[PDB]
Amino acid sequence: KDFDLIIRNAYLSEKDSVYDIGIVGDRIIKIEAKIEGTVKDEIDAKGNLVSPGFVDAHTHMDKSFTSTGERLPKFWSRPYTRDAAIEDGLKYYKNATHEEIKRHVIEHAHMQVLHGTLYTRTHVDVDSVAKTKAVEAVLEAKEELKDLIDIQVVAFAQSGFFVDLESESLIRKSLDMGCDLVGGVDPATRENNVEGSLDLCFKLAKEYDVDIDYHIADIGTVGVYSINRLAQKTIENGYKGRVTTSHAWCFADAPSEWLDEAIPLYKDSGMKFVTCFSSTPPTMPVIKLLEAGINLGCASDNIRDFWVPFGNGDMVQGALIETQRLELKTNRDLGLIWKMITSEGARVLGIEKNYGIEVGKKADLVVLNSLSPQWAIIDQAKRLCVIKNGRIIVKDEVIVA
Amino acid sequence: DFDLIIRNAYLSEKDSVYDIGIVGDRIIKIEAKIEGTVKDEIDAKGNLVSPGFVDAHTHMDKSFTSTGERLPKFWSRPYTRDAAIEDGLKYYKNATHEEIKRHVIEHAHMQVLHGTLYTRTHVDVDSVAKTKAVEAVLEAKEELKDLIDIQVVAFAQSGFFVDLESESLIRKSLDMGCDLVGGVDPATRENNVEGSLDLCFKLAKEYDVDIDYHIADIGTVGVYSINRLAQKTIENGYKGRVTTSHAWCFADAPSEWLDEAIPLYKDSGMKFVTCFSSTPPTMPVIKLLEAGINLGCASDNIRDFWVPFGNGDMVQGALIETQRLELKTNRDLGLIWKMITSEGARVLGIEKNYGIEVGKKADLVVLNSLSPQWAIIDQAKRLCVIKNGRIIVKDEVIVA
Ligand SMILES: [Cl-]
Ligand SMILES: [Cl-]
Ligand SMILES: [Zn+2]
Ligand SMILES: [Zn+2]
């Protein structure tokens, strides 16, 4: 048969028209208004949007769903602070077993693929209590999940390199076990040492030739200062394009001139950013960042744990959440958010060359029940079909892999 | 014996699981186990059963006018009140009775699918819509009465002192049977705060109806406008009969302005509605509720030239509010749940017949989640909706 799979009547946003999509193995082979030829399996999109797989650029699969199990969410009789949530992890990771972490990771993944997410980058706690236990469970589950979702794994020193002094050796080990990236947390208010926390991160990154994804959630000028130091060291170390800053809440409350002055530094350093829809500050200058050409992806962050009680692993729900946080309504703006959950996330992850609905690219696709990006955000219809490596893995809200 | 029993229903106010027995349109028995079987039963399977959600502010008449193309119509340009007013005037020129009616019913069906059984809609009354939109809404309201209770506000969307035909058209609308009267922005729309408000109260007293005013003006001008409204509420003997919609101004006005006004609002019995399509992120929602202010919640417009969004789903709206307002604790999520239920009931005036208690209306929603908190978080679809003791929704289908 000429194609292994054809998608019929697929509206493609980037072309603003309806096409048949022909697939062989794990690749898109043909995109034509009508495809002639024999074919093994077919899906009719019926004039609706077909999209590349959504990118969830920042998750914590390892400690997800730990809030579940009772009538009320566990942990949430008290308000969120970073330091208190760090203490809850340490206590949780004391008795947590390999298999239950694994189970949580797989559950998290299944929930994501059900919503059309086919690429994620997760961080995993590495500290003196979790040790490499959580890393091992994640890497193992990642192996089992490879026909459903691509996972990048950040060795994440959640307690601080200069607070928990066992962090440096545990991370080295985690990187040797095969984690893809390295990152720490809040150089200023967590580490109390900006130059040293950052220099150490770059040293470890260069030793194992891995990219970097840093949690910088500190607000105000202290946050912008921290990100500036990071971007400057990015250049000094020859790591242009290899560094991501997660959160960057500080862009919301720091004076706007601080960001205006830093933008050229961010472009020069190839600095990439991820805003999580469970925390994007309402005054975050998201539109402004994108119009200035900054690479800004989007993400669930934590899901149903002791940091964040929320989460459905659904980036289309997350897109709606961002329109509301940021008070957007125009079709153009809703389109920029759609880019955030797709092609911007691809760039953050480094996979842009194989990403998109174009001849030659990976047959990783989502058939939606809505007419357009805008309409999908608005109506929140469930996914009709999910396709990974040219194979149907989701149909009718069931994982059929 | 019972016309209907709901089995294994978790009830939040009691924090326990119960069977619920219903006869006609009333709840008759709430017991841990109800002895005997009946023809019509629903098993909630340990999940939350809730009173019907209240969507305290909608515009059913002009809903879904954005639909019909690949991209939402109207939204190639940004929102301003005045521009959206002009779009309505143009839309209402050629709009027919039946098309408005169709939109109203569609809106209602969408709402009941999500467990909303009570709504208050505003309907445009001005020199182009005239009473055409009122007539279509009232008619559809009559057809929908087995699905959802509707209150209808005669709403002078263009301004009493801007469109001078408004006063007579509203009087007519009220005589046709609209339940409430309201205007818009006494300051930046009417350019006359004392007169726009005094006229609204005159019309209200002529027809003995309650009031629901759109005050979206920001800052001190908004708070000042609401203060004048609350003060006239007292002067006119209308304590408890006045609702202020939006009140965005509580978000940006200095906090001391609100602190000083709160006793006035309590004295006047002022009621408020925040719409989840616009609640400002710094709106002091929690603070209002802890001070004992009655604050309901609402979709506002749905897929029109004011708001492109909307699914008429208050549980989705509750999630939206947690994100706008940055709430996470179980207590705070519980206050939002109150906003979409019992607070809305109070705004609408129906609290005596509202709740899952013996004696109250058998208007209920069987959810697929364990608790208010878990429902907000997981957004599971509704299992069953019951209105006047009859099943009207099952497995996402309207079965009435
Ligand atoms: Cl330093
Ligand atoms: Cl005045
Ligand atoms: Zn994180
Ligand atoms: Zn309104």
Author numbering:
A (entry chain A): 3 to 403
B (entry chain B): 4 to 403
What's written in the study?
AtzC is a member of amidohydrolase protein superfamily and is the third enzyme of the atrazine mineralization pathway. AtzC is a tetramer, according to PISA, our SEC data (native molecular mass of ~210 kDa), and previous reports, with the asymmetric unit containing half of the tetrameric structure. The second and larger domain which contains the active site is a TIM-barrel fold. The active sites of the independently solved structures show similar architectures, each having three histidine residues coordinated to the zinc ion (His60, His62, His217; 2.1 to 2.3 Å) as well as Asp303 (about 2.4 Å) and a water (2.0 to 2.1 Å) bound to the zinc.
Trp309 has been shown to be motile in the comparison of the ligand-free AtzC structure and the inhibitor-bound structure, suggesting that this amino acid moves upon substrate binding.
